[PDB]
Amino acid sequence: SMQEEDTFRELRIFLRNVTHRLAIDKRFRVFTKPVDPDEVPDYVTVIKQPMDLSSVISKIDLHKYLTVKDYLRDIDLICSNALEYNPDRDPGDRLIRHRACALRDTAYAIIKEELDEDFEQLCEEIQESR
Ligand SMILES: Cc1nnc2c(NC3CCN(C)CC3)cc(C(=O)N3[C@H]4Cc5ccccc5[C@@H]3CNC4=O)nn12
Secondary structure, eight states, rough: HHHHHHHHHHHHHHHHHHHHHOOOOGGGGGGSOOOOTTSHHHHHHHHSSSOOOHHHHHHHHTOOSSSHHHHHHHHHHHHHHHHHHOOSSSSHHHHHHHHHHHHHHHHHHHHHHHHOOOHHHHHHHHHHHH
């Protein structure tokens, strides 16, 4: 319905805003663009589902997220990819992991404080009906 399309439009606006706030955070610079195979050569073959904040924006705009839960699955993927690709004790690896965990925690904390749970419930019920 038209009221349902208004719901999903509000969801997209909310998701773009959260994503923009993560993207402008200096700690999350390495998550703002897809990992480049020329700069990180052993990546594209080891990480099956690459995910980053620009690809998240593209997915919002293509109407791929119908709930915050779907959006959070991709935020989780940015974090899980960094943990998987950088598992070593070395500082470089530990720094990416801390930044990935911090990006995930920040997205969840923003949504916990600003997302009305009845708004999410409505999105989930429209999604389940389709
Ligand atoms: C994500 C993600 N997951 N793991 C990594 C990582 N790992 C390092 C850990 C330490 N060892 C020794 C080398 C591999 C490095 C970068 C990274 O420094 N990037 C990425 C993504 C990106 C995006 C926007 C702006 C800057 C960057 C920089 C430069 N080019 C890249 O492709 N990202 N990354």
